[PDB]
Amino acid sequence: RRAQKHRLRELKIQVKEFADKEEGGDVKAVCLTLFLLALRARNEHRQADELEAIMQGRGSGLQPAVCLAIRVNTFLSCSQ
DNA sequence: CGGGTTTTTGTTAAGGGCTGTATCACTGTGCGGCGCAGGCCAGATCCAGG
Numbered sequence: 001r002r003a004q005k006h007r008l009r010e011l012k013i014q015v016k017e018f019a020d021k022e023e024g025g026d027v028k029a030v031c032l033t034l035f036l037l038a039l040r041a042r043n044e045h046r047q048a049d050e051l052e053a054i055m056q057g058r059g060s061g062l063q064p065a066v067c068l069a070i071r072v073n074t075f076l077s078c079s080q
Numbered sequence: 081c082g083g084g085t086t087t088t089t090g091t092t093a094a095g096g097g098c099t100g101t102a103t104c105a106c107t108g109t110g111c112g113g114c115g116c117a118g119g120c121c122a123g124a125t126c127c128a129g130g
Binding site for chain 1: 087089
């Protein structure tokens with residue numbers, strides 16, 4: 001991670017200086033969207049669907065109201 | 081042999097937020113029996129006052 005800062009510590013400046021001009025400065029989703037379109041150019045369409053399902057909390061993860069319904073409706077105590 | 085040189089990886093501390101684990105007084109499994117509690121009411125049942 002520290003060397004992924006050391007190798008991208010100029011392109012990181014490029015993406016934060018383009019983020020404020022193109023949309024306004026939203027640093028997460030612009031590189032997310034570049035990663036989606038990079039999978040499009042790399043031609044994986046199911047993998048990007050798993051990506052957006054994760055980033056909507058669907059393909060795994062289990063949004064915590066559903067886990068609450070599972071912990072409640074099967075008589076599971078909190079320790080179990 | 082090792083200065084140079086490019087990068088890897090770390091530390092520095094002020095804040096923040098997510099996740100992990102300790103802490104607190106308590107549980108239950110240590111034993112058996114039974115119709116019974118509460119309340120209401122008609123039918124005996126006793127008790128002294130003549």
